[PDB]
Amino acid sequence: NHNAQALNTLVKQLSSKFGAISSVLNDILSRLDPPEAEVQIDRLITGRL
Amino acid sequence: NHNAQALNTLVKQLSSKFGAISSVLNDILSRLDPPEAEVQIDRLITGRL
Amino acid sequence: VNLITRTQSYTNSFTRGVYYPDKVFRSSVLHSTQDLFLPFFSNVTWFHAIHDNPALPFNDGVYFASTEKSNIIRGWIFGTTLDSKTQSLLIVNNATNVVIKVCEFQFCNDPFLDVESEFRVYSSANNCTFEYVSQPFLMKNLREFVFKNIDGYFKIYSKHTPINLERDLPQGFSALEPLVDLPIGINITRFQTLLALHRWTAGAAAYYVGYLQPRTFLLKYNENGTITDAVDCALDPLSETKCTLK
Amino acid sequence: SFTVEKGIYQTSNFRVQPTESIVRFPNITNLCPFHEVFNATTFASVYAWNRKRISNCVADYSVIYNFAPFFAFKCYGVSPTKLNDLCFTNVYADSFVIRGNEVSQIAPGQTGNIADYNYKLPDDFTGCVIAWNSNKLDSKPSGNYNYLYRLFRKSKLKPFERDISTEIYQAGNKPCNGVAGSNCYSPLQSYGFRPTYGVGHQPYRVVVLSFELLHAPATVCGPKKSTNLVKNKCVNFNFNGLTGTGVLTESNKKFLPFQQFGRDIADTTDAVRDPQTLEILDITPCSFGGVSVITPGTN
Amino acid sequence: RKRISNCVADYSVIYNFAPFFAFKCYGVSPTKLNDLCFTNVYADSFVIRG
Ligand SMILES: *[C@@H]1O[C@H](CO)[C@@H](O)[C@H](O)[C@H]1NC(C)=O
Ligand SMILES: *[C@@H]1O[C@H](CO)[C@@H](O)[C@H](O)[C@H]1NC(C)=O
Ligand SMILES: *[C@@H]1O[C@H](CO)[C@@H](O)[C@H](O)[C@H]1NC(C)=O
Ligand SMILES: *[C@@H]1O[C@H](CO)[C@@H](O)[C@H](O)[C@H]1NC(C)=O
Ligand SMILES: *[C@@H]1O[C@H](CO)[C@@H](O)[C@H](O)[C@H]1NC(C)=O
Ligand SMILES: *[C@@H]1O[C@H](CO)[C@@H](O)[C@H](O)[C@H]1NC(C)=O
Ligand SMILES: *[C@@H]1O[C@H](CO)[C@@H](O)[C@H](O)[C@H]1NC(C)=O
Ligand SMILES: *[C@@H]1O[C@H](CO)[C@@H](O)[C@H](O)[C@H]1NC(C)=O
Numbered sequence: 233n234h235n236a237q238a239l240n241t242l243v244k245q246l247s248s249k250f251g252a253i254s255s256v257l258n259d260i261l262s263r264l265d266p267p268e269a270e271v272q273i274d275r276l277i278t279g280r281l
Numbered sequence: 282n283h284n285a286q287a288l289n290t291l292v293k294q295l296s297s298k299f300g301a302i303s304s305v306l307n308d309i310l311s312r313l314d315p316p317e318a319e320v321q322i323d324r325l326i327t328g329r330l
Numbered sequence: 331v332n333l334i335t336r337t338q339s340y341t342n343s344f345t346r347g348v349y350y351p352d353k354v355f356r357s358s359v360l361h362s363t364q365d366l367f368l369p370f371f372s373n374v375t376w377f378h379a380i381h382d383n384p385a386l387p388f389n390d391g392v393y394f395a396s397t398e399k400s401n402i403i404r405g406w407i408f409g410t411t412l413d414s415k416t417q418s419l420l421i422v423n424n425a426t427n428v429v430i431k432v433c434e435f436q437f438c439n440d441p442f443l444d445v446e447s448e449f450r451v452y453s454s455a456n457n458c459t460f461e462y463v464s465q466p467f468l469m470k471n472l473r474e475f476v477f478k479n480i481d482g483y484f485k486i487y488s489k490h491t492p493i494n495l496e497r498d499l500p501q502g503f504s505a506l507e508p509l510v511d512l513p514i515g516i517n518i519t520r521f522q523t524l525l526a527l528h529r530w531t532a533g534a535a536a537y538y539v540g541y542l543q544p545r546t547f548l549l550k551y552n553e554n555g556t557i558t559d560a561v562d563c564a565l566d567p568l569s570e571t572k573c574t575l576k
Numbered sequence: 577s578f579t580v581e582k583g584i585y586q587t588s589n590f591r592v593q594p595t596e597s598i599v600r601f602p603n604i605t606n607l608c609p610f611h612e613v614f615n616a617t618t619f620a621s622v623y624a625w626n627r628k629r630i631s632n633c634v635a636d637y638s639v640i641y642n643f644a645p646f647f648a649f650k651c652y653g654v655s656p657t658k659l660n661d662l663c664f665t666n667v668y669a670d671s672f673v674i675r676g677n678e679v680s681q682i683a684p685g686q687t688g689n690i691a692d693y694n695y696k697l698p699d700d701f702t703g704c705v706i707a708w709n710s711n712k713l714d715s716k717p718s719g720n721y722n723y724l725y726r727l728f729r730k731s732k733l734k735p736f737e738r739d740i741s742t743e744i745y746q747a748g749n750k751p752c753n754g755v756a757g758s759n760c761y762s763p764l765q766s767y768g769f770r771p772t773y774g775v776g777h778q779p780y781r782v783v784v785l786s787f788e789l790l791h792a793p794a795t796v797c798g799p800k801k802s803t804n805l806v807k808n809k810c811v812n813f814n815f816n817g818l819t820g821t822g823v824l825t826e827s828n829k830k831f832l833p834f835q836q837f838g839r840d841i842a843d844t845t846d847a848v849r850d851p852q853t854l855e856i857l858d859i860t861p862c863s864f865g866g867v868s869v870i871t872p873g874t875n
Numbered sequence: 876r877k878r879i880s881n882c883v884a885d886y887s888v889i890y891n892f893a894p895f896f897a898f899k900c901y902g903v904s905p906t907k908l909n910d911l912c913f914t915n916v917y918a919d920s921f922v923i924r925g
Contacts, residue, residue: 267685293841312662352791517734775896
């Protein structure tokens with residue numbers, strides 16, 4: 233039960249925004265100017281780490 | 282072996298940028314305007330912590 | 331005039347074409363680099379020219395090797411159409427100087443030197459801005475050169491080494507050192523080779539050509555600061571394991 | 577706390593403080609000719625932009641404000657007020673004339689006609705951009721037609737790449753055959769400049785300054801006096817803009833003639849080459865350590 | 876207030892209609908407008924002080 237719960241929580245954590253405009257990298261890449269996309273990607277990277 | 286590896290990893294970690302423009306504090310201080318240098322110093326501080 | 335014929339063969343590069351990636355001193359460390367390198371154990375073309383479409387592709391970069399001594403080889407040409415409608419490079423060497431120009435030359439099918447007028451290379455050049463003059467590059471011996479361009483910057487590396495009697499490329503390691511970086515800022519697709527012909531008279535030349543690719547390398551520095559060993563991380567599973575374990 | 581129990585405690589560290597300061601700069605006496613770049617009374621078209629190289633001179637940027645009536649700088653890798661301290665290897669100056677509403681396209685990671693067909697900047701650009709209005713000089717009542725820009729191109733340009741070829745752009749399967757017929761155009765349009773347009777449609781003069789960091793011996797930087805060289809003492813040092821503190825000693829390392837710096841595992845400088853005398857020096861941190869206090873109880 | 880729907884939008888021509896200096900966008904970037912696809916567009920216009 234503990235192992236399954238931990239893995240499920242880890243998977244569920246991928247849908248958080250962490251202060252960015254979206255939780256999907258493709259949307260950020262397709263909607264934002266390239267030098268302005270790093271400030272949004274960094275938040276997601278830090279949260280997932 | 283474990284102790285040596287841990288210390289070596291800790292020392293090696295000092296050369297990361299963590300999203301800043303450089304990993305050397307002196308370069309940031311000498312190349313950037315003083316109120317604009319904090320946003321770069323903070324990233325390094327957080328990574329090292 | 332067309333008076334040159336060419337023949338081709340294939341051979342193995344072994345482990346050649348390593349250069350210092352930066353002008354930084356290091357010693358007794360293992361370093362990881364990602365750059366345009368010549369892959370280990372790859373096809374290299376052996377060209378014999380005797381007296382022809384020597385407009386070989388340039389691709390990302392070029393590795394050139396020559397084991398001759400008669401100094402029959404000199405200079406190179408670079409461009410995308412080799413016509414007067416587009417600018418092109420005119421690196422030319424002689425015994426005293428090197429002259430590099432970026433003009434719209436009307437090049438000929440088979441360019442060479444009369445020996446010493448370039449009237450057989452291009453008809454005329456009218457509009458251009460970039461000219462440069464310096465000390466010539468070329469000075470039982472093997473000469474290795476690397477040419478590339480990134481972000482409008484043309485970079486050249488070179489090395490000269492002594493070689494014994496051998497019919498193939500040697501075994502071992504020999505690093506290359508940078509010479510010239512220039513603000514080229516043009517489009518390069520094909521390149522060319524120039525030879526001098528006395529009057530004409532029969533001539534022979536031979537050289538090795540290879541192409542660079544983006545690769546990751548692991549270099550080893552000895553206590554004196556020289557590169558003595560390298561590992562290519564995309565050759566076989568063992569090399570990948572070595573790179574991962576550093 | 578105001579009371580201490582019996583034991584041994586770790587309080588702080590001791591360090592030796594620097595005594596003086598050392599500045600070492602190369603032998604440069606000329607002045608960089610920024611005046612010739614500005615007021616050239618003739619600016620090239622955007623599709624064929626001029627490029628000038630600046631090297632081996634002393635650069636005083638504060639005088640640039642007296643040459644053109646611009647409002648402010650726009651720098652990316654550095655700050656305008658710190659330009660008088662850094663030392664570079666080469667400087668590049670590009671100049672051209674564009675429209676008012678295209679000025680935003682001269683920036684890293686931009687898209688548009690000018691960005692992808694005329695002038696492109698790298699995504700890791702380090703330099704400054706200056707632009708100012710030139711309506712009183714580049715406008716005519718009938719309409720100026722000496723400035724042109726490219727409209728059609730097969731593929732997008734690369735950073736710092738120029739195109740000069742004039743041909744007939746083909747938008748169909750049939751060859752153009754050198755005539756501007758159907759599906760065949762001339763890829764060079766001309767700005768029509770009039771003094772009665774709005775601010776967004778008036779001509780603007782643009783100058784871009786590009787810097788090169790220290791990888792080779794430096795050649796361009798500002799007027800900083802150079803002091804003597806002291807050794808075997810804890811001192812502040814400044815070598816070509818590289819600042820630090822420590823002890824400078826003789827070096828036994830065998831630097832290659834094209835190398836200028838030495839790094840260690842932590843990627844910090846530990847060997848340097850003096851700009852004036854081609855000599856290698858080693859840098860070590862000043863003496864330091866930790867202090868512990870042993871006491872019985874304050875009672 | 877005007878509603879725009881069921882059409883192909885080419886924003887690069889807007890620069891030829893008014894002598895403005897630059898866009899001011901919040902959720903997106905001006906240079907990426909030619910790739911995104913929306914459901915409806917609304918345009919509001921008025922006159923104010925400087
Ligand atoms: C070189 O290329 C040929 C075919 O073009 C191939 O058969 C050979 O394995 C390659 N490598 C060599 C000769 O080392
Ligand atoms: C080599 O070429 C340069 C450039 O044209 C020329 O000045 C020089 O005289 C040439 N060398 C000889 C030995 O003629
Ligand atoms: C330079 O370019 C112009 C315009 O493309 C052309 O008319 C001229 O013939 C070229 N050569 C010279 C020497 O002006
Ligand atoms: C390193 O350099 C020293 C001094 O020249 C020399 O004695 C020694 O043999 C060198 N060692 C290697 C491995 O090159
Ligand atoms: C140089 O630029 C200044 C700008 O104030 C101008 O007044 C002056 O006439 C210019 N000189 C020349 C020779 O163009
Ligand atoms: C360079 O030349 C090649 C050869 O025709 C062409 O395909 C390409 O579009 C040109 N431009 C760039 C940026 O590669
Ligand atoms: C720099 O100038 C000083 C004094 O004029 C001189 O002693 C020194 O040799 C010079 N160094 C170089 C590299 O020119
Ligand atoms: C449309 O706007 C342009 C703006 O340049 C103007 O010149 C033109 O007269 C306008 N047309 C109408 C019908 O209002």
